[PDB]
Design a protein around this ligand. Structure first.
Ligand SMILES: O=P([O-])(O)O
Ligand SMILES: O=P([O-])(O)O
Ligand SMILES: O=P([O-])(O)O
Ligand SMILES: O=P([O-])(O)O
Ligand SMILES: O=P([O-])(O)O
Ligand SMILES: O=P([O-])(O)O
Ligand SMILES: O=P([O-])(O)O
Ligand SMILES: O=P([O-])(O)O
Ligand SMILES: O=P([O-])(O)O
Ligand SMILES: O=P([O-])(O)O
Ligand SMILES: O=P([O-])(O)O
Ligand SMILES: O=P([O-])(O)O
Ligand SMILES: O=P([O-])(O)O
Ligand SMILES: O=P([O-])(O)O
Ligand SMILES: O=P([O-])(O)O
Lengths: 377, 377, 377, 377, 377
């Protein structure tokens, strides 16, 4: 199955394979297998574009393999191809660690293969190309330069497994995945987990309900705050290869400015009767967002209350909550300079009252919910 | 109507078609149709510039078509042409989504065709060029690099329909459209909607009045805050093709720094007599702006008032208002750290008093109005 | 007076005209007229530099004219020339809109012609060069790239009119103009307006006094805050062509970080006797600066005072003042979160007292004066 | 041991040595010694890549030495090699200051040599290459351009000494070092110091425990705030060459945005009985973090307390603490604007009470702990 | 002493003079004088690098002179040379304004000449090279691009005069100068001023004491806040040419992020007895730093105090202090929003009490000292 290939020539970041000098370099550097040069024609707004391009001949798949020392960074790869066959063919994009998800390329048509490649730690780009595909252009470009984003249309097919990985430098990002599915089973799912997005922090991609035998479409939209100390992002399809619910999805990854999703004044009562109570106020871990606390106050405090502490943490960093305000020691409301950032869970720990005489206290809290899942540390 | 064309050569980002090597590449990549090479002369400050350039011959329009894998981004296209005809000709710029708006190119004159092209998702650039146009230069440049802006002069003609789309990366932008119109009808129009600017959020472009049989000019100026999760912007002319009010307009799109349009101390009374009241305080949705709340206070509170909550939202994200301060639970005025950002609508919800004994409360509010329509989420 | 010229060749951003290939391109693209190639010598630190360069021959002026689709942006142009004449020659730089201000180039000397050119909306660069000038180098570079500034030495001559325009992207800029003048009149000028700097907002450049028959020097230094929605800046000399006060000046335009010019606690009393009073507190419109209010308080309020509102505005945006604090409705002092930005004029509107019993109130205000004239909106 | 070498040719930032013109330049500039050109084959995804590349022949090691005036900055070097020997060979990377730590390159295999080189003050790059190594590619790239990071996999071998140095421009950085160790001794270690990271400020890299005869893996993760006045960072392995605990580690250096590790409300009592007490509250010097104080308050103050001052400092800058709040002179709690940044140690100095009548005061403090060791000044 | 030189060829930003085409350009553009091509050898890690390079022959010094229109900006020049003489030679770097300070280049050794060149306003680079120096490479690179800094090692010799000038764009910068001195005199110095750093603002570089006949070393480290309106920085050695205290020093200029040097709570009493008192609180003008005031309070105010104003200024901008808080008119302590930036001198002006009954008031102040001398305006 393996073949030998000559690889002496310097790699280019762009090839138009209908140019002789680009083709000559391509097949002495990153192309594996043989090719036949053919005249290729396809329609553009009713006009017929005609080029001579290399076509993969009958036999084993060809490959493109790049181990050269490209400039490090995250590349969007675009391969312009034309399927000369009268039947569909499939391609399995690299996506750094995919080997199951596919593109379906229709008979007698031009098609854009999108791929993603992180050049770090000697990573080697690899993709196989089936017989009858003409290769017209091959493009390597770094994304997140000059304000570009990853924007892959809804063409990625999965049947329950697959991976896409990419490195993100510091910043906050939106990851958007338009999808369509076709449920072929008689099973009704509720809270169907399609997949997860994670750094070393995990965000589940969940659909409220997928009706039996139904088809539908929607969009996943989540946000990651990349502090910068954990840059490798991993998307995994988790619902399981044999389920019978094929999805087709797109992938958009783009830098955003701060997004305050909402700001809220909230109130929570706690009744104390002799025992310590730990009351969750808010937990947005795994949601694609985090919190910022601006103000807190507790009413109903009496000498019968022995403990009343507001605690918070970044659960992706630590499961141990730290006290951010002590209403007994510090007073019934937070001072003007009090501002709690980079947390995603808040609880109130209180104690007091008796088994015969309970005390009810009321916490009020003003907080912002801000886009971006917090990373591990 | 369709023609075949050879497209083997690598596309360039700049062509001067009076250079042989540029012309040769141009007509083996992106130019459809035949040309005649002619000596072209035109005036610059009284001097006669003379070049040899390709001219579209009598017959079908020529086209420029680009499906090549250009670096992704938003391009400003400039085509320098010279109309060799003794009559005006028209061109229909691509603008990503336009096929009705035109440029009018005068007889025997040089002209700059401006176009806009978003290279994402395999988008294909397309423009037709009529017989007698000489094509002198063709330029592709990314805007919003190096602090550039889109700046098209007042030369775009519409008679009631048309579209222009473009991708904007994160940032706040001004969109300015200088216009002139001629109302050839005997009808005077009020709150005339010329068009809309939208992302997935909508801003109407409205003219207070257009006098019957009148002609006039003005400038639309609106702002978009692109968080970055919705980047595709769409301008639509909506007044209707057969109306009889031709407009000529320009388009300037440029990044801005934060613009505080004004800061205001405002007061609002509400009379309560037993029933819940929901009182709108401010709603700037669709205005090209948003709000920031700095301080609020309510006077006149008594035990007769059972509810008094200030609520706010980004209506482009959610029609459900969230409470941002509760004057009963939290006290009659907001604390120093209270600061409500990224909203565009505010209301007061209150209840109390009786059918026989009403209570009047007064809200005071300090807020900023900030340039930039908020996007959907 | 007009001549024809061949313009087939691609324009370059740098030419050294003593190189044959640069000269060949230059005279087949942007140079109008004939030249004579001559050996040119001039002194550098006592050494004689020798080059062969094109010289404008006896006859009509030559021109440089550039209408090609250069990358858009603001260019600083430098032309290195050598005056082979035994007499002075003058050149009139383009400066986008100038046709009266001049450089005076001494006999038998090297000289740097600085020019400014905004490549937007098909703008065409144009400058004439008199006989006997050798053209050594021609340089086009974008400024405000890589932290560069416009820095033209004190060599620009005006006798009372002239214009320089340039586009500035978003940011705050200093505009500095070192000048010398010779008053050839016996008139003592008081508050002599030399010129103005404006966007669509105007800053007068004023000298306190110019003594009769006097000669002097100084520096204008003003600042513009370019929000980004109005980028075209225009400098105009306004004192009048026949006045008899020639100036020579330089031009430095450079981006700055925020500059707090001063912060002040100020007090203002107002006496009320039955009628509404509108008292100006501060107005810095047209000064090259704006204001930020941090704190305000009014003492002396009694039930005899019926109105006491602090109002502010950006006069370049609106002549209608908005209330920023109401001391009656809101209380005698501003809250911690009160912060009024982007204004340049403040007034107090008050009413109360009677014709027989006046009331005196005292406003205190803390504000910053910040560099940068606010733009129109 | 030393050899002469020709070095006339300009240095390149990238060489692919299977290209004749790159090899020719390489061996007339930076390569020392002889080479034999050989056909080299190795496996990539089951395919056989074949190139002709220079191999170090039997005899003395070859060297690469670069003293040329490269653009200044910090370079990541990658050398793609292939070990043609049937035995392992070792290489000692430059790392600016290393001459003991090694890579181990397996028999008959391709390997990526990573190195680091700071081009400042005439620094000269140097690495030796043993016989039988084929050199395929040599890459010099600046890191921290375009959001790149240093990311070297876990392949660096130390047995108790070694240095790596690099220059960081202003910013905050994470330094992450995944490691594995093998303790060959019967000795049990506690608070094992592997090494230190320092600027002119020192951060110990410590392992809680290394069990006797144990092997283990973990990750060091520390942060440096580079103000910019001290840019040269030095990593030192300190545990001692003969210890018998070999480590293998990786190195990741990347820029981060502000990281609030946690925010805490803390309380501390101090009992006074006639003598001055200096009570440490918090000291995070050498931890890879610093502090920011937001609010402080002291309860229990009476006329019996004569001194109560909160003091802070950046210990890397100064061992003398400065008073940041005086609870006697200033009052029992800090004002809204009180905010103490860029410190890493806090203490309370207090005095009062008597030998017969003690007074207990309680300090409460709200502070953030922020990633980044503070530098010296 | 002056020579003629041919200068037709375009200037390059990098020359390796052992390449024929680089040398050919070099000696037809910027090199003045004759050269002899010689085989040059020197040691690098025990290996002998051999190149053929131009050597200045016996006779007058050669010169490098550059008046060409290089891209504007601040350049670091590196000249790699080799002294073929068996005696030391000296070179005088340009440094924009130097003509006394020298490098000493040892016999038979390679050496890096560092120089600084501001390309603005037609500035011409100039340096003389003595007989016997081989010139191997010549490099022109803009600093402050890509996060580079000026970093010249301790090799600049002065005996009491000399200048270095450079342009800095907006930012805050550290200027670090490691130095060594030899006092050949038995004079012991106190507060020895070595030199000054200034913009149009001045910072003295002072050494506490220089013992008689002593030698020593140390480092000057000061900071400049470049707002951007004054960008030209001048370093002057001022101690005087004949003093007999030679220094050798290096120069490091690098951009920094905000540096809070310290934050302090300070107290100051003032006794009033009928006369106005102006009490200096803090003055850091000329120190390389500035202040920011966060909070102020005065205790001891009575009706016997008629004036109590805190005043501040940027003395580099204005010698007139402005009132920043009036404790009589405004109250005994500053409000939460009070924050005074960009000042470097604070005083309290007070009046009250009588010749027979004095009043003592106490000011408390919290302020930050921040790196960066403020510039003139
Ligand atoms: O390498 P990029 O895609 O992060 O710029
Ligand atoms: O791959 P990392 O960036 O999570 O270490
Ligand atoms: O950095 P933030 O705005 O995501 O909290
Ligand atoms: O791709 P641009 O046009 O957003 O820079
Ligand atoms: O395509 P979007 O970026 O406007 O959702
Ligand atoms: O981010 P802004 O547009 O609410 O200031
Ligand atoms: O075009 P520039 O001068 O704004 O860079
Ligand atoms: O020319 P503008 O920048 O005022 O539209
Ligand atoms: O943006 P600023 O200049 O109002 O601070
Ligand atoms: O030189 P760099 O790697 O610091 O950008
Ligand atoms: O090595 P430095 O960056 O501390 O001077
Ligand atoms: O320098 P900071 O923002 O990390 O405290
Ligand atoms: O011109 P630079 O060296 O300031 O970037
Ligand atoms: O030369 P400047 O930048 O001090 O005006
Ligand atoms: O930010 P600063 O330098 O004005 O204190």
């Amino acid at each position: 199955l393996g073949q030998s290939f000559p690889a002496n020539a310097k790699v280019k970041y762009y090839y138009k394979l209908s140019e002789k000098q680009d083709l000559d370099a391509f097949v002495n550097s990153i192309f594996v297998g043989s090719y036949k040069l053919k005249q290729i024609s396809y329609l553009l707004y009713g006009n017929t574009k005609i080029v001579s391009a290399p076509v993969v001949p009958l036999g084993p798949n060809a490959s493109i393999i790049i181990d050269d020392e490209l400039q490090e960074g995250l590349y969007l790869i675009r391969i312009k191809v034309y399927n000369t066959n009268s039947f569909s063919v499939t391609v399995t994009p690299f996506f750094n660690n995919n080997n199951t998800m596919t593109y379906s390329i229709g008979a007698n048509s031009e098609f854009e293969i999108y791929d993603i490649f992180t050049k770090e730690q000697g990573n080697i780009y690899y993709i196989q190309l089936p017989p009858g595909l003409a290769i017209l252009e091959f493009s390597l470009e770094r994304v997140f330069e000059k304000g570009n984003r990853i924007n892959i249309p809804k063409i990625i097919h999965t049947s329950g497994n697959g991976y896409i990985s990419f490195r993100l430098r510091k910043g906050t990002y939106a990851i958007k995945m338009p999808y369509s599915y076709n449920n072929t089973t008689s099973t009704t799912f509720t809270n169907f987990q399609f997949g997860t997005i994670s750094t070393s922090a995990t965000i589940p991609l969940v659909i409220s309900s997928i009706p039996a035998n139904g088809s539908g479409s929607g969009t996943f939209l989540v946000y990651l705050k990349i502090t910068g100390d954990y840059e490798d992002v991993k998307f995994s399809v988790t619902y399981g290869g044999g389920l019978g619910v094929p999805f087709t999805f797109g992938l958009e990854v783009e830098e955003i400015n701060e997004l305050v999703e909402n700001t809220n004044f909230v109130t929570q009562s706690v009744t104390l009767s002799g025992s310590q109570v730990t009351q969750s106020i808010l937990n947005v871990q795994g949601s694609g967002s985090h919190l910022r606390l601006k103000y807190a106050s507790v009413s109903g405090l009496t000498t019968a209350v022995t403990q009343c502490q507001l605690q918070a943490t970044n659960l992706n960093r630590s499961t141990t909550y730290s006290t951010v305000w002590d209403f007994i020691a510090g007073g019934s409301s937070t001072p003007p300079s009090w501002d709690i950032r980079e947390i995603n869970s808040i609880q109130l720990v209180a104690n007091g009252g008796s088994s015969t005489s309970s005390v009810t206290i009321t916490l009020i809290l003003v907080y912002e919910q801000i886009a971006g899942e917090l990373s591990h540390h």
